[PDB]
Amino acid sequence: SRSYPCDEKKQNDSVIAECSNRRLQEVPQTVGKYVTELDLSDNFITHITNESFQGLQNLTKINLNHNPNVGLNITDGAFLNLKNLRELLLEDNQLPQIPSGLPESLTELSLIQNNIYNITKEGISRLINLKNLYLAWNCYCEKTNIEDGVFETLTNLELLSLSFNSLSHVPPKLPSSLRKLFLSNTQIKYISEEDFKGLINLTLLDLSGNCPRCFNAPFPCVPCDGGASINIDRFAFQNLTQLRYLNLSSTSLRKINAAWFKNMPHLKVLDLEFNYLVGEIASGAFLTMLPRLEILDLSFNYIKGSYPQHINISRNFSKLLSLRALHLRGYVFQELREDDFQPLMQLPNLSTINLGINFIKQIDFKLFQNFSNLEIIYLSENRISPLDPHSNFYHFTRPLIKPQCAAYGKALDLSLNSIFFIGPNQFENLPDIACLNLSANSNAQVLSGTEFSAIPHVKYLDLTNNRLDFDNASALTELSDLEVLDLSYNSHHLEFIQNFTNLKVLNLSHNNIYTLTDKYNLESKSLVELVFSGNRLDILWNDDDNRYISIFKGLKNLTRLDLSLNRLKHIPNEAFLNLPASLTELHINDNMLKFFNWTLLQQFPRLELLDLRGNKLLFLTDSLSDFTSSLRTLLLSHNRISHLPSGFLSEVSSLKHLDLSSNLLKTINKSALETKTKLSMLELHGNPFECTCDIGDFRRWMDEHLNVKIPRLVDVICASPGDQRGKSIVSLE
Amino acid sequence: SRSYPCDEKKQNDSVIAECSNRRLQEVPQTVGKYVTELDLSDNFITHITNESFQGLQNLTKINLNHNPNGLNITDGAFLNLKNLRELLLEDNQLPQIPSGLPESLTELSLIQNNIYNITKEGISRLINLKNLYLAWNCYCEKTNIEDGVFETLTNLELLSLSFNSLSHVPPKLPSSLRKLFLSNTQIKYISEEDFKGLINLTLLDLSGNCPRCFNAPFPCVPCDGGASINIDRFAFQNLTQLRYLNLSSTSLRKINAAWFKNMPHLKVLDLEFNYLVGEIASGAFLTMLPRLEILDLSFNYIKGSYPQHINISRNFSKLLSLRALHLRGYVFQELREDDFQPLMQLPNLSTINLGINFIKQIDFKLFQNFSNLEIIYLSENRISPLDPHSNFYHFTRPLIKPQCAAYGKALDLSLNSIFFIGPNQFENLPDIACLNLSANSNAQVLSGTEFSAIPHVKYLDLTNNRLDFDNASALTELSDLEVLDLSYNSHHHLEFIQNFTNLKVLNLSHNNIYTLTDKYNLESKSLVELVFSGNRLDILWNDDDNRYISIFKGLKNLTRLDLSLNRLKHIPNEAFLNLPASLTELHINDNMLKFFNWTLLQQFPRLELLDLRGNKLLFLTDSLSDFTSSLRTLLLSHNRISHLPSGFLVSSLKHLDLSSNLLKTINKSALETKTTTKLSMLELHGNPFECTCDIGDFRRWMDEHLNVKIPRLVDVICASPGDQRGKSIVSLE
Numbered sequence A: 001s002r003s004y005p006c007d008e009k010k011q012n013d014s015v016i017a018e019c020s021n022r023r024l025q026e027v028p029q030t031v032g033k034y035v036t037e038l039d040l041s042d043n044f045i046t047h048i049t050n051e052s053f054q055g056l057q058n059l060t061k062i063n064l065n066h067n068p069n070v071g072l073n074i075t076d077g078a079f080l081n082l083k084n085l086r087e088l089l090l091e092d093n094q095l096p097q098i099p100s101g102l103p104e105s106l107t108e109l110s111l112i113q114n115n116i117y118n119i120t121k122e123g124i125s126r127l128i129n130l131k132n133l134y135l136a137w138n139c140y141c142e143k144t145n146i147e148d149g150v151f152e153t154l155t156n157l158e159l160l161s162l163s164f165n166s167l168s169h170v171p172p173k174l175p176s177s178l179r180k181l182f183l184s185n186t187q188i189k190y191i192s193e194e195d196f197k198g199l200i201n202l203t204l205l206d207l208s209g210n211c212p213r214c215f216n217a218p219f220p221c222v223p224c225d226g227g228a229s230i231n232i233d234r235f236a237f238q239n240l241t242q243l244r245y246l247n248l249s250s251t252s253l254r255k256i257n258a259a260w261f262k263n264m265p266h267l268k269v270l271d272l273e274f275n276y277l278v279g280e281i282a283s284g285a286f287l288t289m290l291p292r293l294e295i296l297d298l299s300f301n302y303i304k305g306s307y308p309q310h311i312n313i314s315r316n317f318s319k320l321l322s323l324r325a326l327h328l329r330g331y332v333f334q335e336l337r338e339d340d341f342q343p344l345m346q347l348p349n350l351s352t353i354n355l356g357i358n359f360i361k362q363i364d365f366k367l368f369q370n371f372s373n374l375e376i377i378y379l380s381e382n383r384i385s386p387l388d389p390h391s392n393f394y395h396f397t398r399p400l401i402k403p404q405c406a407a408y409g410k411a412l413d414l415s416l417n418s419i420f421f422i423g424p425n426q427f428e429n430l431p432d433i434a435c436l437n438l439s440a441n442s443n444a445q446v447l448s449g450t451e452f453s454a455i456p457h458v459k460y461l462d463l464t465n466n467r468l469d470f471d472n473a474s475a476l477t478e479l480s481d482l483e484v485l486d487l488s489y490n491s492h493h494l495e496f497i498q499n500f501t502n503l504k505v506l507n508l509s510h511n512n513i514y515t516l517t518d519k520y521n522l523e524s525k526s527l528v529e530l531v532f533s534g535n536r537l538d539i540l541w542n543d544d545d546n547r548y549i550s551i552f553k554g555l556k557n558l559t560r561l562d563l564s565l566n567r568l569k570h571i572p573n574e575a576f577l578n579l580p581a582s583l584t585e586l587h588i589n590d591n592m593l594k595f596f597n598w599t600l601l602q603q604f605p606r607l608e609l610l611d612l613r614g615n616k617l618l619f620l621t622d623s624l625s626d627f628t629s630s631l632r633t634l635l636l637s638h639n640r641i642s643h644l645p646s647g648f649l650s651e652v653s654s655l656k657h658l659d660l661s662s663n664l665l666k667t668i669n670k671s672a673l674e675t676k677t678k679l680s681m682l683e684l685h686g687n688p689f690e691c692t693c694d695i696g697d698f699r700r701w702m703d704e705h706l707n708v709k710i711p712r713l714v715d716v717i718c719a720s721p722g723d724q725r726g727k728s729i730v731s732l733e
Numbered sequence B: 001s002r003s004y005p006c007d008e009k010k011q012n013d014s015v016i017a018e019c020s021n022r023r024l025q026e027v028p029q030t031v032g033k034y035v036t037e038l039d040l041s042d043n044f045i046t047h048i049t050n051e052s053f054q055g056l057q058n059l060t061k062i063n064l065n066h067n068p069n070g071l072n073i074t075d076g077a078f079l080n081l082k083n084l085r086e087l088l089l090e091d092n093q094l095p096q097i098p099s100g101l102p103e104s105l106t107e108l109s110l111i112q113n114n115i116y117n118i119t120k121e122g123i124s125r126l127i128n129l130k131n132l133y134l135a136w137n138c139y140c141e142k143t144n145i146e147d148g149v150f151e152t153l154t155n156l157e158l159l160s161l162s163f164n165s166l167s168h169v170p171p172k173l174p175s176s177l178r179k180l181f182l183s184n185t186q187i188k189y190i191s192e193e194d195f196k197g198l199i200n201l202t203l204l205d206l207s208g209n210c211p212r213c214f215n216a217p218f219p220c221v222p223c224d225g226g227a228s229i230n231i232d233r234f235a236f237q238n239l240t241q242l243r244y245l246n247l248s249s250t251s252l253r254k255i256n257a258a259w260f261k262n263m264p265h266l267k268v269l270d271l272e273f274n275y276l277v278g279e280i281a282s283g284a285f286l287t288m289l290p291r292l293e294i295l296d297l298s299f300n301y302i303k304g305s306y307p308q309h310i311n312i313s314r315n316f317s318k319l320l321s322l323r324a325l326h327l328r329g330y331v332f333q334e335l336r337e338d339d340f341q342p343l344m345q346l347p348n349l350s351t352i353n354l355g356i357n358f359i360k361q362i363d364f365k366l367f368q369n370f371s372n373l374e375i376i377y378l379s380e381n382r383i384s385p386l387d388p389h390s391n392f393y394h395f396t397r398p399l400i401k402p403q404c405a406a407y408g409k410a411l412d413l414s415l416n417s418i419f420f421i422g423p424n425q426f427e428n429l430p431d432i433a434c435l436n437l438s439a440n441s442n443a444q445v446l447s448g449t450e451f452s453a454i455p456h457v458k459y460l461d462l463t464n465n466r467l468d469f470d471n472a473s474a475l476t477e478l479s480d481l482e483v484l485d486l487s488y489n490s491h492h493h494l495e496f497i498q499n500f501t502n503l504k505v506l507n508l509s510h511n512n513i514y515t516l517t518d519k520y521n522l523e524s525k526s527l528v529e530l531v532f533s534g535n536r537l538d539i540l541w542n543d544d545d546n547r548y549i550s551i552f553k554g555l556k557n558l559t560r561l562d563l564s565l566n567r568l569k570h571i572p573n574e575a576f577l578n579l580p581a582s583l584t585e586l587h588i589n590d591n592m593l594k595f596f597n598w599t600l601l602q603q604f605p606r607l608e609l610l611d612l613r614g615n616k617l618l619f620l621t622d623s624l625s626d627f628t629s630s631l632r633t634l635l636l637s638h639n640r641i642s643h644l645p646s647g648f649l650v651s652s653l654k655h656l657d658l659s660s661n662l663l664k665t666i667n668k669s670a671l672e673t674k675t676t677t678k679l680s681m682l683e684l685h686g687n688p689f690e691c692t693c694d695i696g697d698f699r700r701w702m703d704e705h706l707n708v709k710i711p712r713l714v715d716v717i718c719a720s721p722g723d724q725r726g727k728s729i730v731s732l733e
């Protein structure tokens, strides 16, 4: 009952069949009839007929995106026999028109990135149950021909996306049940009062990219003739009472009419980025019309060729009583004064201030104490000195600060600034900072133990991409509550580490650590994770340089250790035995290990994950079960292992995941797989299998052991013979 | 008489022999007896005996550096060479100085060896020694020098003992010494009797003794208690002819003026990597140097401080002979006009180096107040809108590229914070002829008025920026502009180019030019060289779009054109014929060209160099002479050419490159040139030659045509047969 070529999974009673990226030329006739969701995306399927989904009555969702993957010929009524089909996805298929004969039961239809120039009633008006319709990126053709009243019959339509299409005008006769109308980059330069007259339940209106302001756009950007903005009429939004999301990004707006928000009391998210609103930020009459706005974005609204001394924030910003996040990137100003941000100081819920990419030379950091609920202060990409069509293209969705850092408390991001050394007054008058980012600052500070005295409760410190000197034993010790220290890519004396009573995670990756002075051991009673990748452990472990045999022995509470990219060819037996006995996860991947003494794994009873990927290992052990009794995951991919030993899949019941992909395995004999096993996953793709009569012994083991899920069966290829080269091992005589 | 394995050349009557980097296991017995200079460096030679240089009486210079890439040299191995004047034994792992060296030696270099003892047994016999290099030997058990080992060397002019654990200056040095190198020698104390008998010494290098560790490329260990080198008041009282004093990295805090009382000729003083901020402010020693031309006080900053101004002593005005002032790494916020007043009356001060100073603002009017300023180096600052044979402490490379500096006054504002050209950016600046605004993240929309305060700029470097030059008036205010460098420019309309009447060189490399607006051509009556590498000419030339077939046709005066890295697979015939007929040098290297129509070369009568390296060309033309009549250099290396056609060897072709191709053999009919050819160089290394009986026909052509110099004969390898694999084609039968 092993599924091929799809990977069947019974996720929450319904069976999902992952059949994507498998070089399938046609729809497989070996998919189980009980499946409900089929994903055949990124394949080379060229034809879709009414005999492609035979016996699949329970199919509710079909994904046929990117077919063929670098058009698709669908016949009329090809999906009509699927009475339970509620979700059809046909993105990037080069379809010349909307497929005729789609089932009435459909609710979610996505025809993004196609050659559809005409929206006719022949293929849409029959779909009365449609709730979500995506028709983006079709005319990006002089204009998209939309039949007058094509969406009128779709009385259940809640989402209509017509973005990235040459529309010129808002389509008339839209259903009153619409909640989300997407019209981004549609060449609609004028908005009339009757364009959204019958849309009283509309909660989202995206009119971005119309008369754009070209600023590093990832798609063609053509500004309006005479530098004109989108012409929104005074009474255009007078009937959108439930509107909560207004996206007016990249619309070249110079003035914001307050009359637009008179009948909009619920507006929650306003996007005014990539416009010319420096004057509107200074005066702002519209600011008094948004009492329930939580997210305001006025990013990249700068005047080209000017670098003002101060940011001009209107007093009316104090009327934004519900404000939670203020995004003010790309304003371009030299100094942030305490009086500049006075209107924002009495807002009860303002937790995020985004001031990235502003070229600010100096900030009066005392002003941040004067805020009530500030949790995130984003100041990245400034000049502070010492002492995918399914994406939001205009607003950054990713968290400004890494959630792991922000979870500790108040976060301040001063990365990518001009702090070439930590000044003596660097952190004076700052709030109780718990998360600090000083990444990529070219900071050549000689840390002595007094630099972070003004903010000593920092629990997460990011000092990556700097030239710091932490050879002093007192370095960073003033941060007694420090739990996460990130020193990656820092261009030795690691005594400072033992002074921390609550340090849990330390990252010393790519520090080029080839020598250690005085205290040759790294001690710590609280450290749980150490990242030592990108260092020179090969130099530290020599025939005469035996001083570093117990380098990580002092880390008695360590559970995760990363020793990758260390150019390790050989690991001394005494050095391996001196690793923390408390280790549960060890990574020695991407090295040049010729040999691995599996006997030494006896002194690690808690070790669950051993990662030896990307190495030159040639042989394994037949008595692996005698050494370990807890190893649940063993990753040995991209190695030179040519033979799997006898009894490898037996007596080691702890092993649930075994990775042996991209190795040199030609065959798996009966004596080697003689289990006299709780292995739920065995990876074997990318091996030069000999698909002759002796491979049938391993094939029989796959039929008897159906619980051992082997992923990527289409990639388990045969090297020999010539007649079976390029085929899967499961497809044999 | 074709030399093997060396490349002999009778350079200025004396015959040189380049035999380096040829994987030679032993000294070749096939070197001509008439040669005078043998270079066997970077080989795998392990033994040097007295029978290694038999019959080589005219040998005056032997280079045996890096062998093997230690070396076993017997006693008196070079004694039979009566004319040996120069012996080079660097990086050979020699345990001691080779015994039995010829007394005729004048230059001896034993750098990077394991020589711990300097004995009279191997040195005192060499009485004609003029240059002795013993650097990098104990870098270690402290270097032992026999008392008076150099005393007998009465002709010794240069003695280098740098990078050795000396602790003290060696006593009994010859009075004929002119250059004493003692850098990084752990000599912490200098006594009045250390250089008592060295009256003719013109150079004294005492750098790296008590170092100031600042990104050193070698072990740096500072003196106990942060002490400086202890130079006595009367230590330099007898060095009257001293012209070069290197005191770099010596942790000096005070400079005693008494050191330069009897030093009236001192020309170059190196005081970089010290703690002389206080000495730069007061400077009593400045009145003792009236003939100093080069002063370097770089990286003398106080750690942890960022002063508002640079404190330059009034005594700097007494440096009447000063030509170059290097003041990097001082670390200051502002350069005022009054700060550089002492330097304004110096008649010969042409170079001011102020790199890596983190200067926020400069009063640029002060540069007008200088008399002979030619180079103003301000790279790596914060200006806002509106190898043992090397000098390891001072930058020898020119601050500004000579090509730029040759035009006149040069100003280097590269790697600064000029994110856009301000309206007052170049006001009050001298008549600038060379300007560097590289790597400034400048997103300026060039309109034609930005460089109106410095309109005589003839060489402009705007590389690594985000400039917008789509306007036809861009840069046109620089009427005398001759060289424009726009390499690596992110964020096309190239009309501005035709407005320049004297533009000669234009570099548009790595601009990602895949589309050109309305003016689909590039016109210019003065342009001579165009660099279009790293662009998308493959996109500009296609089956649907034929609008750019005459893109470079308007460049009627062009002689050099670079079209490399353009991802070119095919070049349309009409597009190739529309290239400038005045072209003398064309480069289409590192592309993916499957075919090349050699017939089209008839419309280029001035073309001398055709570069088609790194392509996928499979075949050549049988009648190449019929198409071209001036092609002197043809580079076709790294291609898929498997057969050279009959009659391939044009009475113009002087250099033919066919290396790293797929040539198995060269038939008689291909090299049967009946007429006299002028081919002086033919490269053929890296080809899979079949060293069978058929290859003897090409071997006979090499013996008859000795004038056709074939370089790298050791790399012309045989692929087949197994007995000849790895051998040169000239070593067969």
Ligand SMILES: *[C@@H]1O[C@H](CO)[C@@H](O[C@@H]2O[C@H](CO)[C@@H](O[C@@H]3O[C@H](CO[C@H]4O[C@H](CO)[C@@H](O)[C@H](O)[C@@H]4O)[C@@H](O)[C@H](O[C@H]4O[C@H](CO)[C@@H](O)[C@H](O)[C@@H]4O)[C@@H]3O)[C@H](O)[C@H]2NC(C)=O)[C@H](O)[C@H]1NC(C)=O
Residues within 6 Å of the ligand: A180, A184, A204, A206, A208, A245, A246, A247, A269, A271, A388, A389, A390, A391, A392, A393, A394, A395
């Ligand atoms: C103008 O401004 C508007 C308003 O902000 C923007 O609208 C947003 O547009 C994006 C798409 O461009 C929407 O994001 C997508 O939402 C889908 C639905 O979300 C609901 O359901 C999920 C559960 O499935 C809930 O978690 C969620 O809270 C919602 O209730 C998601 O399914 C999408 O996720 C998929 O794509 C992302 C990105 O590739 C992946 O990371 C995911 O793993 C997943 O595969 C996606 O998040 C967003 O919801 C819209 N907002 C609203 C309020 O509707 C416009 O995009 C903007 N215009 C431009 C041009 O920028």
Ligand SMILES: *[C@@H]1O[C@H](CO)[C@@H](O[C@@H]2O[C@H](CO)[C@@H](O[C@@H]3O[C@H](CO[C@H]4O[C@H](CO)[C@@H](O)[C@H](O)[C@@H]4O)[C@@H](O)[C@H](O[C@H]4O[C@H](CO)[C@@H](O)[C@H](O)[C@@H]4O)[C@@H]3O)[C@H](O)[C@H]2NC(C)=O)[C@H](O)[C@H]1NC(C)=O
Residues within 6 Å of the ligand: A404, A405, A464, A484, A486, A488, A505, A506, A507, A509, A529, A531
């Ligand atoms: C220096 O070194 C540190 C320490 O290694 C690095 O920081 C860690 O980085 C990793 C990513 O490389 C982080 O791991 C990720 O955490 C995400 C958030 O964790 C929460 O959510 C998960 C459930 O999703 C919970 O189990 C968990 O308890 C948390 O509540 C996870 O969502 C991520 O998992 C997903 O991705 C991985 C692949 O990345 C998959 O394997 C998973 O199956 C899953 O799909 C992931 O685990 C980790 O949290 C960071 N730790 C800290 C302390 O910050 C630094 O990045 C490194 N610095 C540099 C410059 O390299």
Ligand SMILES: *[C@@H]1O[C@H](CO)[C@@H](O[C@@H]2O[C@H](CO)[C@@H](O[C@@H]3O[C@H](CO[C@H]4O[C@H](CO)[C@@H](O)[C@H](O)[C@@H]4O)[C@@H](O)[C@H](O[C@H]4O[C@H](CO)[C@@H](O)[C@H](O)[C@@H]4O)[C@@H]3O)[C@H](O)[C@H]2NC(C)=O)[C@H](O)[C@H]1NC(C)=O
Residues within 6 Å of the ligand: B179, B183, B203, B205, B207, B244, B245, B246, B268, B270, B387, B388, B389, B390, B391, B392, B393, B394
């Ligand atoms: C402390 O300060 C002193 C004074 O400045 C420094 O001394 C210089 O040291 C460097 C070597 O480290 C010297 O440079 C070398 O000079 C050789 C001789 O030059 C003479 O001969 C050539 C012709 O052959 C003339 O052009 C020249 O004017 C001189 O008359 C050169 O032969 C060397 O060239 C070779 O090496 C370089 C670098 O690899 C290559 O580019 C060349 O192609 C060639 O292979 C080289 O230039 C320099 O001359 C010394 N100055 C003086 C006045 O003697 C100390 O180095 C400095 N200490 C430290 C530690 O930095």
Ligand SMILES: *[C@@H]1O[C@H](CO)[C@@H](O[C@@H]2O[C@H](CO)[C@@H](O[C@@H]3O[C@H](CO[C@H]4O[C@H](CO)[C@@H](O)[C@H](O)[C@@H]4O)[C@@H](O)[C@H](O[C@H]4O[C@H](CO)[C@@H](O)[C@H](O)[C@@H]4O)[C@@H]3O)[C@H](O)[C@H]2NC(C)=O)[C@H](O)[C@H]1NC(C)=O
Residues within 6 Å of the ligand: B403, B404, B463, B483, B485, B487, B505, B506, B507, B509, B529, B531
């Ligand atoms: C953007 O594009 C421009 C134009 O191509 C580049 O600028 C040129 O860069 C090249 C180097 O890549 C420069 O060429 C070199 O010039 C040296 C100085 O020239 C003088 O000396 C020679 C004799 O040595 C005279 O014939 C000449 O008339 C000058 O008086 C030469 O010494 C160099 O030759 C040596 O090196 C080359 C290999 O590089 C060997 O082939 C030679 O045999 C020889 O050993 C060399 O010719 C050129 O001068 C620059 N031109 C200008 C206008 O500045 C930019 O570099 C490029 N920008 C970027 C970022 O890539």
Ligand SMILES: *[C@@H]1O[C@H](CO)[C@@H](O[C@@H]2O[C@H](CO)[C@@H](O[C@@H]3O[C@H](CO)[C@@H](O)[C@H](O)[C@@H]3O)[C@H](O)[C@H]2NC(C)=O)[C@H](O)[C@H]1NC(C)=O
Residues within 6 Å of the ligand: A380, A400, A401, A402, A405, A415, A416, A437, A438, A439, A440, A462
């Ligand atoms: C401290 O500040 C630095 C600089 O802002 C942060 O580094 C940035 O972190 C993000 C997320 O890890 C990186 O983005 C990633 O880029 C790759 C490549 O495009 C992409 O594949 C990923 O999906 C992701 O978007 C970003 O490149 C990186 N920038 C630099 C210069 O390193 C850092 O995360 C901050 N630390 C904390 C604790 O917030």
Ligand SMILES: *[C@@H]1O[C@H](CO)[C@@H](O[C@@H]2O[C@H](CO)[C@@H](O[C@@H]3O[C@H](CO)[C@@H](O)[C@H](O)[C@@H]3O)[C@H](O)[C@H]2NC(C)=O)[C@H](O)[C@H]1NC(C)=O
Residues within 6 Å of the ligand: B379, B397, B399, B400, B401, B404, B414, B415, B436, B437, B438, B439, B461
């Ligand atoms: C304008 O300013 C920029 C920035 O200073 C100059 O670019 C720099 O040019 C030099 C010389 O070509 C490069 O130096 C080289 O570095 C390598 C590696 O260390 C070294 O091996 C070479 O011998 C040489 O020293 C330097 O890397 C490069 N820097 C950057 C950021 O591109 C540019 O040359 C200046 N232009 C003019 C006209 O002076």
Ligand SMILES: COc1cc2cc[nH]c2cc1-c1ccncc1
Residues within 6 Å of the ligand: A300, A302, A303, A304, A305, A306, A307, A330, A331, A332, A357, B419, B420, B441, B442, B443, B444, B466
């Ligand atoms: C948001 O504005 C910028 C962003 C970047 C990034 C690099 N360079 C920049 C320049 C600017 C800018 C500022 C003012 N006037 C013109 C351009």
Ligand SMILES: COc1cc2cc[nH]c2cc1-c1ccncc1
Residues within 6 Å of the ligand: A420, A421, A442, A443, A444, A445, A467, B299, B301, B302, B303, B304, B305, B306, B329, B330, B331, B356
């Ligand atoms: C020349 O001084 C520096 C150079 C660099 C380069 C990166 N960061 C730096 C910092 C400094 C500095 C200045 C003053 N006090 C301490 C350190």
Ligand SMILES: *[C@@H]1O[C@H](CO)[C@@H](O)[C@H](O)[C@H]1NC(C)=O
Residues within 6 Å of the ligand: A033, A034, A035, A055, A056, A057, A058
């Ligand atoms: C569809 O699912 C039901 C259970 O919900 C099952 O009885 C039926 O047999 C399935 N249909 C097919 C074709 O397997």
Ligand SMILES: *[C@@H]1O[C@H](CO)[C@@H](O)[C@H](O)[C@H]1NC(C)=O
Residues within 6 Å of the ligand: A321, A322, A348, A349
């Ligand atoms: C602040 O935000 C919280 C949700 O995070 C909300 O419950 C609360 O009512 C908001 N306060 C005001 C005054 O709007």
Ligand SMILES: *[C@@H]1O[C@H](CO)[C@@H](O)[C@H](O)[C@H]1NC(C)=O
Residues within 6 Å of the ligand: A342, A345, A370
């Ligand atoms: C906080 O801001 C107010 C003005 O809004 C100002 O009067 C006050 O002095 C500031 N707080 C402190 C502690 O100075």
Ligand SMILES: *[C@@H]1O[C@H](CO)[C@@H](O)[C@H](O)[C@H]1NC(C)=O
Residues within 6 Å of the ligand: A447, A448, A449, A450, A472, A473, A474
């Ligand atoms: C370490 O830092 C302390 C605190 O500033 C300082 O006193 C000490 O000298 C430093 N240690 C070394 C070895 O320089």
Ligand SMILES: *[C@@H]1O[C@H](CO)[C@@H](O)[C@H](O)[C@H]1NC(C)=O
Residues within 6 Å of the ligand: A504, A525, A526, A527, A528, A557
């Ligand atoms: C070990 O680490 C855990 C998790 O950080 C911590 O709770 C525990 O206290 C540590 N154990 C000791 C002995 O410090």
Ligand SMILES: *[C@@H]1O[C@H](CO)[C@@H](O)[C@H](O)[C@H]1NC(C)=O
Residues within 6 Å of the ligand: A573, A574, A597, A599, A600
């Ligand atoms: C494994 O380690 C033990 C203990 O150091 C040693 O005796 C044994 O010989 C090692 N085995 C291999 C194969 O290196």
Ligand SMILES: *[C@@H]1O[C@H](CO)[C@@H](O)[C@H](O)[C@H]1NC(C)=O
Residues within 6 Å of the ligand: B033, B034, B035, B055, B056, B057, B058
């Ligand atoms: C050395 O050179 C002279 C000419 O200067 C020549 O007569 C003599 O034969 C040469 N010696 C050898 C060994 O070739």
Ligand SMILES: *[C@@H]1O[C@H](CO)[C@@H](O)[C@H](O)[C@H]1NC(C)=O
Residues within 6 Å of the ligand: B320, B321, B347, B348
């Ligand atoms: C200035 O330098 C030139 C050489 O470049 C020299 O001839 C001249 O004498 C110098 N002037 C003075 C006053 O030293």
